[PDB]
Amino acid sequence: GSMLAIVRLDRELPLPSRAHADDAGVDLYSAEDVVIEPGRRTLVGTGIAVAIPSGMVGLVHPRSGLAARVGLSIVNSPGTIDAGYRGEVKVNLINLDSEVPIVIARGDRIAQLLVQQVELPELVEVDSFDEAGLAV
Amino acid sequence: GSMLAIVRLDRELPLPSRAHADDAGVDLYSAEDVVIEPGRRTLVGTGIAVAIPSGMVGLVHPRSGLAARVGLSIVNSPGTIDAGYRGEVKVNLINLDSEVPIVIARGDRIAQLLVQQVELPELVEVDSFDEAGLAV
Amino acid sequence: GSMLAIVRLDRELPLPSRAHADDAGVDLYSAEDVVIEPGRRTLVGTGIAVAIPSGMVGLVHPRSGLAARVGLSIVNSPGTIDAGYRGEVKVNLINLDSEVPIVIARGDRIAQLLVQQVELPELVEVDSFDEAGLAV
Ligand SMILES: [Cl-]
Ligand SMILES: [Cl-]
Ligand SMILES: [Cl-]
C-alpha cells in the first residue's frame, strides 16, 4: 500500500482517515463555526496540510448526501492541491440554496480529498495537428 | 481492453454505452420526468448501478453543450462512485439559470460517467513535513 | 518526460505553459473581453486547441484564489476534452456572485487544464452483480 503525510495545524480536530478501504475520498473537517447565507460563499480552513506526492494531484470534492441536499458545494470544484503546496487546505464553500442558510459547526465534514496520479506534459506549440507522434 | 459491469435497474431505459472509442465519458439517462425551476435542485435516479473495480473510482460529471448552455449542472460535481457502491446512481441536478426552468424527460441524457484509477493512501500524521520519504 | 501538442488559434495570446514542474494544471486565457453579470453564464473561447493523447482525458477546472473569491466558476465543471477533440477549447463560465459583475479582459486567466490517464471500459450488462470477475 501507500501513505499520505498529513499535518494537523489545528490539533483539536480529529485526524482525517479513510473510513473504508475502497473509499475514493477522505472527509475533511471545518476548523470554523460559520453560517453561509443563501447564495453566499466563504473560504473555510480545514486545519490540515498534506504532502501530495511528486507526480500526483490532490482533488478536493464536495460531498454527496445531506450536505449536497442542503445545497453545499465548492465554488472552484474540484479544488486542486499540487505536490508543491504544504499550506493549510482551505475550501471555498458556497450555499446554492436560494432561501435557507447552511450552518456549519467546527468539526463538521465539509469536503473530501481524493489523490490521483497526474500527467505533467510540457506543452509544445505546433502550427496544426498534421505532425508525427499524435493520436489517429 | 477492459469492462465495466452495469445493471439496468430500470429495464425500460436504453443501456448506456461509450459512443466513440476515445470518449472519456459515457452518458447516463434520467429515469424520471421532472421540471427543475430556476435555482432549484433535485436528486434524480439514472436507473443503473455499476461495479467500479477495486482501486478505481467512478466520476459523475455534468455534460457540455446544450445541457450546460441551459444551465444544467450537478450540485456536488464531480460525483464519486466507490468500488463499494452497487446501489442506483443518482444525480443531484441543479438549474443554474435565474429565469428559465429546465424540462427533463425520462430517457434524457443528464450526466456522464468516467472511470479512473485512484490512489488509496493511508493518511499518516506527522508533526511537520521535515520527514524522510517526502517530495523535495 | 512527456509532451502535449497545442495550437494557438489566436496567435496574439500568450502560449499556455506549466509555471512550475509540479503544477497539476496549466492556466488557459480568455480570447474575449466580456462582463459576466451576477448569476449569468457565457461560453468563452480560450483561443487554443490541444491533442489529448489516446487513453487520456483533458480536464478543465476553475481556478482558486482571486477568481474563485469573486465567484467565477464553470457551469459543467470539470470540463472534459477527449482525445478525439481538436477544436477550440471553450469554457462555460458562470458568475456565482449575487451582486457584483465579473469583468474579464482578453488575456486573463479563466481556467486550468489538467491531463490524466482515463480508463475506457466497455460497459457490459449483467442481471445482477452475482457474477465472476467483480470486486469482493
Ligand atoms: Cl509547459
Ligand atoms: Cl487512512
Ligand atoms: Cl461501451
C-alpha to C-alpha distance for B27 and A19, rounded to whole angstroms:
30
Q: How many CB pairs under 8 A join A and C?
A: 118
C-alpha to C-alpha distance for B97 and B69, rounded to whole angstroms:
9
The beta strand positions in chain A, using DSSP E, are 3-8, 26-29, 34-36, 41-45, 48-50, 56-61, 72-74, 79-82, 90-95, 102-104, 109-117, 122-125
In what side-by-side order are the strands of the sheet with C109-117? C26-29, C109-117, C56-61, C79-82
Q: Cβ–Cβ of B131/A7 closer than 8 Å?
A: no
Residue numbers in B near C76 (CB within 8 A): 61-64, 67-68, 73, 77
Q: What stretches of chain B show up as alpha helix (H) in DSSP?
A: 66-69
CA distances from B35 to A79, B103, C39 (A): 30, 5, 20
Residue B6's φ and ψ, nearest 5 degrees, are -135, 135
Q: Are B101 and B22 in contact (CB under 8 A)?
A: no
Q: Are A15 and A74 in contact (CB under 8 A)?
A: no
Residue numbers in C near A119 (CB within 8 A): 2, 56, 114-117
Q: Which H or E element spans position C59? A: strand C56-61
459576466: which residue's cell? C36
Which resolution, in Å, applies to this structure?
1.6
Nearest to A121 among C2, C15, C77 (CB): C2
C-alpha to C-alpha distance for C30 and B25, rounded to whole angstroms:
26
Residue B81 is labelled as binding a ligand:
yes
Q: Are C123 and C81 in contact (CB under 8 A)?
A: no
Residue A63 is labelled as binding a ligand:
yes
* CB neighbour list of residue A65: distance below 8 Å, 6 or more residues apart: none
Top-level class of domain C1-136: mainly beta
464553500: which residue's cell? A93
Domain ranges across chain C? 1-136
Q: Cβ–Cβ of B115/C117 closer than 8 Å?
A: no
Nearest to A123 among C18, C24, C53 (CB): C18
